[PDB]
Design a protein around this nucleic acid. Structure first.
Lengths: 104, 81, 96, 91, 97, 78, 96, 92
DNA sequence: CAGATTCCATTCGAATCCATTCGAAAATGATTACATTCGAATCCATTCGAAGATTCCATTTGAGCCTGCTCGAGCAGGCTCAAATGGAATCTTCGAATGGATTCGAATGTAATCATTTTCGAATGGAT
DNA sequence: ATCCATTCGAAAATGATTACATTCGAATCCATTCGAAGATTCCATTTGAGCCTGCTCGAGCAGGCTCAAATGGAATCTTCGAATGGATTCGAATGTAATCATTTTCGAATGGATTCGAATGGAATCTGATG
């Protein structure tokens, strides 16, 4: 029979497709090992799970069942490391409420 | 088309300032805001039209804008990638 | 007649516009401005709708960030009013 | 037909929060995020391989490239997860 | 006895240190500081002279640029004396805080 | 060892920057800023050194780390 | 009959072709007139910078060129200042 | 062995200023500058080729990369010089 | 005491999740070379120790220039209301422009054989 | 006086020419999405004008605190010199990633049934301002 490589590694993200994608970015004569794909898939899955967990907590706070870009922005900008890593613009997020003490 | 920069009214600038967190506003802020907006738009649109012209096309797509914004250092999530 | 002291409705609008997520500029004037600006680079161009909307989102985010920096610079000099000097200093420090 | 990361993002989400859904715009944002991070790691790995005058790319290059561009405790936890996955795979 | 008003020797020093190109921090203390900082990441390390020289040049350039921005912030508030709040504001606007 | 960056050295750097008068609490702030910058750069220099299985930090590691940070430097092999 | 002499340049065309061929992902080809264009661009930029630095040296009444001259030339031109944002090791600062 | 751009920089300098020399440190700085610009142009050209689903790199990619990277009034002269060189190469 | 903002109820309509057909692609099995790893052999280049004339640095004193707090005048931005205006929104038609197929024809890589060309040694007389 | 920038001589890479083999990207045609141009209303948003208050600016005093000068004296700089440590090169012997040929499992596009948030319709507090 056939056993997928992601099942052997114990992941959800694909190992074969990521291997094929990595082989297309090597300059000129360049080979790619079989255990670079496993490392890359594990990294991507870890980061995805972290962001999704924070966003789900933010959504649960507001008594809502689904996730929207507002919750993604609230989750990202409330964490120091995620804020440092992600500096892009999220279309539909807005700003975190904050009013200076001198103006009040 | 002429003097289209005056369609960025004074209430719109006041709303953007309020979301920025500004309590009082002077009377000469609006012209400065219009100037800075024009400069920003000119840079980005120039790069987007260059990207479109390279591909031998006549329609400006969302991906040219996304690529130009990534070039200037202003990555945007939501419209492609 | 009922009146509010100067500075209360301002805080009300600050809360209102910081709690929401929509766009704050009208769409037709911005689209007209985009077309007029791009007239100088190539004649007889065409635009998708997504291109205009991406440009609007980027512009709004840029202006909001700039106004936050301007407010910081205005607070430094012991004021609550923002003036062109604060915009100029904020843009100068950012290397613009 | 075109490729996307929607199936795996939904699988991870159902693994973390088993009763919370996702919309369609948040899916586009997650797709863009994954593509961005992948391109960053790939570029750094290629440069690292170039510096030392080697042609092949291995898990050492990926580990070093993760140790850069990843701040704080993110780097430690990511390296731990990747090492565990590779160790399980090879055996 | 002869004395100078405070403010002219400052301008003379400004001109003298802006016309030159040398380095302004002594070498042995900076070398010791670099080694002590780097001992936190790996023990029993070695250095080249070029590594320490590159680090010194980069550090000096960074500090000079920061002080220019600090002076701008001090002038904004109608002063000639620079204080820590100016450094904090410059670093906050730049993106480091 | 951070106290070996004296007060006259900071005065000289400030004079070259254009500063006319200096407060008395500037020196500790400057020392903190310098320490943070140095740690940030040396971390990546040592990472680059460790990837190549070496025990000596060369000039190229520092040049690459600076270029990564966004502070490109000319005249030291790149 | 070298390619550089046929195009009328001083920078090498074969070496630049070889350099370009080694940064083109997998199964990527490189034309023969990309090298000529690249060599022309590099030669033009080098000549501009050298000309400005030599003018500064003639102003300062010296015969050779030092990193001080390069820093003075680069910081005094708006376009060169915008393009080159690196650190010249041995230049100092521009008086102001 | 170790290749560099010293000979060509000296030739250009003797072309523009026939009576001026150059020291070693200025030569190192010029080498760094040339390498930096070349790497920038090559990367941008590769990205342009990728975006359009092509495989070959031609003078169109180089021209567009030059237009994107160089500031105004510096792109016009560079484009003119490159076009003249390519035409002279092809005609001969 | 008059305005504004946070709670629950009810019917609705936009939106997500599950089901199906099937092409595009991933895993298995041999066979080759290609690239990386494991021992010696120089031999530079970093670290440690010593001597000392001198120049930077640290401490104390005096005083005047800069900053901070109080008070009064005025001036420029906020708040309310009536009248006018231009955006949004819901169809209709038309015409300008991508995107996919099928042949061709222009142009690049690969393999040998020279015929240059650039980098590594000292050698001096010349700007600093 | 002293450091160094330009010359001269050889030798081992390494471009330049000739001849295929074949990817690859121009040249014409045809469909379809898709963007541009017109037309017709409500109704919400913008534009002036009047009023009045609170925030900004300038001046006279007072206290705080940075700078300029003189005297020790200490510690960075320059030169000399072993001891040896670790990068760098050259060979054989391995480890493993690429490339065909099959077979089948997987993920992408199109349809269909709940269902859960998006507008009304109120009621209950919260808060602001003049007395």
């Amino acid at each position: 029979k056939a056993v997928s490589r992601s099942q052997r590694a114990g992941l959800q993200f694909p190992v074969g497709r990521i291997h094929r994608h990595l082989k297309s970015r090597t300059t000129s004569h360049g080979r790619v090992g079989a255990t670079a794909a496993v490392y890359s898939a594990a990294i991507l899955e870890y980061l995805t799970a972290e962001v999704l967990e924070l966003a789900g907590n933010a959504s649960k706070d507001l008594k809502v069942k689904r996730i929207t870009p507002r919750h993604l922005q609230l989750a990202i900008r409330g964490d120091e490391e995620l804020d440092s890593l992600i500096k892009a613009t999220i279309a539909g997020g807005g700003v975190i409420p904050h009013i200076h003490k001198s103006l009040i | 088309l002429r003097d289209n920069i005056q369609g960025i009214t004074k209430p719109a600038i006041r709303r953007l300032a309020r979301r920025g967190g500004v309590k009082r506003i002077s009377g000469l802020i609006y012209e400065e805001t219009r100037g800075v907006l024009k400069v920003f738009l000119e840079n980005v649109i120039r790069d987007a039209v260059t990207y479109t012209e390279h591909a031998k096309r006549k329609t400006v797509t969302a991906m040219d804008v996304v690529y130009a914004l990534k070039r200037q250092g202003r990555t945007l999530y939501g419209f492609g990638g | 007649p009922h009146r509010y002291r100067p500075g209360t409705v301002a805080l009300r609008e600050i809360r209102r516009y910081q709690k929401s997520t929509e766009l704050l500029i009208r769409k037709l004037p911005f689209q007209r401005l985009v077309r007029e600006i791009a007239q100088d680079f190539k004649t007889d161009l065409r635009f998708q709708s997504s291109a205009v909307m991406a440009l609007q989102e980027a512009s709004e985010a840029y202006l909001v960030g700039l106004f936050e920096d301007t407010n910081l610079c205005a607070i430094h000099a012991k004021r609550v009013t923002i003036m062109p000097k604060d915009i100029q200093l904020a843009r100068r420090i950012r290397g613009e | 037909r075109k490729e996307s990361y929607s199936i795996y993002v939904y699988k991870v989400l159902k693994q973390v929060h088993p009763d919370t859904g996702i919309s369609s715009k948040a899916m586009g944002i997650m797709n863009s995020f994954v593509n961005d991070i992948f391109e960053r790691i790939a570029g750094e790995a290629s440069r690292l391989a170039h510096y030392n005058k080697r042609s092949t790319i291995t898990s050492r290059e990926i580990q070093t490239a993760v140790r850069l561009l990843l701040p704080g405790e993110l780097a430690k936890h990511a390296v731990s997860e990747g090492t565990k996955a590779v160790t399980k795979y090879t055996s």
